[PDB]
Amino acid sequence: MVHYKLTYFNGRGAAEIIRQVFVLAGQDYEDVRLTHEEWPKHKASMPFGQLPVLEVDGKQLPQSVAIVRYLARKFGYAGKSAWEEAVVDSIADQFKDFLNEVRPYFKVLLGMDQGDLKALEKDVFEPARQKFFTIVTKILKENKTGYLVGDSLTFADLYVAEMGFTEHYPKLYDGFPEVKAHAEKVRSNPKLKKWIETRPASKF
Amino acid sequence: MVHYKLTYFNGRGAAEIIRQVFVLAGQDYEDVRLTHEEWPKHKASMPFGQLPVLEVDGKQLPQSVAIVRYLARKFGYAGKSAWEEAVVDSIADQFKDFLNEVRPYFKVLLGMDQGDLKALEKDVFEPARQKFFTIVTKILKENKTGYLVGDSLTFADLYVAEMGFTEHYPKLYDGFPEVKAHAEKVRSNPKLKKWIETRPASKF
């Protein structure tokens, strides 16, 4: 009845979680994937000249987390009480800072930078992986449902469990089997399982 | 009533806007400001070993923006419909981006004085100041009340507005007078106006 259109580049990136809420919700949307080469024809048509962008019966919503929170609330995956929704927010925010403090080492194998790789692993990435994964393992333990917050999936689950696709690092949750099992349990969800089985492979 | 406690370092930084949602609502709360020297005494007590943390009658919420949203939601400064709420999210998202992008320029020296001194001002800063202030300028014009989204103040307004400030750089809002009026129109509000004159003096 309601038409949603998601516009992003072809691949996972900043639009994957948004895809995931649509998937969890049983919700039928148009996933428009644009080439880097096509992108300048639609660029000026976006809010901040940026992707991803959501349209809801023709109204534009920019910015990845905005859109994730927006869809999650309307569908029931943002948290079960208002306090829980902020908790959910605070964990998505914290994971995101883990993402940022970890980019410069994400590329020194992937696409760009020219550094001692072993001493970025060890002076950036690992004391960063220690921090967050010990945080996550603590939250799991206290909440005791297998899930991060309450006992149904939230988008905070979606964000951390999806970083399992960086198996460019096989030893990612080595000293952290509780983290590893969270992301098995999230992706063991049936709607998502079949999504990750039938979604386009990408490098990004 | 409800006991609110905000903990942060002695400054505006990540916490200032949490502190303004409070002033706005005329709710008071204990403004705990730690020195960097005291901080190792408090760090294990916090959710992520990070500040700000809000306590709401004993229970801790971490992550400055999670906290900002929790408060504005409760006190009515988050946006005036679900749609609007999300809009407010996106614009403060876009503003956080404007900062991350900008940070490592602002009088440089992200470490020892000797940090390179001015490829930066035009390579990075102005392309963004231009991008973002032109973004805000257009949003203001489309909206047509003097505020970013809908009719009343939101944390969005509060985010952008606080920018007037670093002023260890005098130029801002030169080519952008509707962005200047917005900033003045935000701290035109009397609770806020009086918070500006009254809050502690700090470097950050």
What the block records as the tokens of A16 is 């994957």
Note whether B37 and B105 are same-domain residues.
no
H and E: helices and strands count for chain B: 8, 4
Q: How distant is the alpha carbon of residue B98 from its chain centre? A: 12
Secondary structure (DSSP) of B9-52: ESSSTTTHHHHHHHHHHT---EEEEE-TTTGGGTGGGSTTS-S-
Backbone φ and ψ for B73, nearest 5 degrees, come out as: -60, -45
User: What CATH code is carried by the domain that includes residue B8?
Assistant: 3.40.30.10
Q: What is the resolution of this structure in A?
A: 2.0
Please give the Cα distance from A189 to B81 (Å, whole number). Answer: 32
Name the structure determination technique: X-ray
Which residue, among B92, B75, B90, has the nearest Cα to B155 in the 3D structure?
B92
Note whether A85 and A122 are same-domain residues.
yes
Q: Indicate the SS3 state at residue B92.
A: helix
Which residue, among A152, A137, A135, has the nearest Cα to A94 in the 3D structure?
A135
**Å between B39 CA and nearest CA of chain A:** 18
Please give the Cα distance from A18 to A7 (Å, whole number). Answer: 11
Does the distance separating the beta carbons of B82 and A89 come in below 8 Å?
A: no
**Distance set, CA A113 to CA A16, A107, A110, A168, B104 (Å):** 25, 6, 8, 16, 18
How many interface pairs between A and B have CB atoms less than 8 angstroms apart? 67
Please give the Cα distance from B139 to B32 (Å, whole number). Answer: 36
Does the distance separating the beta carbons of B89 and A63 come in below 8 Å?
A: yes
User: What CATH code is carried by the domain that includes residue A148?
Assistant: 1.20.1050.10
Note whether A63 and A80 are same-domain residues.
no
Note whether B48 and B102 are same-domain residues.
no
Crossing angle (nearest 10°) for helices A155-162 and A16-24: 130
Residue tagged 């259109």 (tokens): A5
Backbone φ and ψ for B55, nearest 5 degrees, come out as: -100, 130
- For an interface test with A, give the residue of B51, B59, B63 to mutate (most A CBs within 10 A): B63
> Do residues B62 and B47 touch, judged by C-beta distance below 8 A?
yes
Does the distance separating the beta carbons of B87 and A63 come in below 8 Å?
A: no
Q: Distance between the two ends of chain A, CA-based, in angstroms?
A: 32
How many structural domains comprise chain A? Answer: 2
**Distance set, CA A53 to CA A3, A46, A58, A141, B162 (Å):** 14, 7, 11, 36, 27
Crossing angle (nearest 10°) for helices B64-75 and B16-25: 10
B84 contacts on A by Cβ (under 8 Å): none
B83 contacts on A by Cβ (under 8 Å): 59
Note whether B110 and B167 are same-domain residues.
yes
A49 contacts on B by Cβ (under 8 Å): 131
Sequence-distant (6+) residues with CB within 8 A of B149 are: B79, B84, B87, B88, B91, B139, B143, B156
**Which runs of E-coded beta strand occur in B97-172?**
none
A94 contacts on B by Cβ (under 8 Å): 48, 62-63
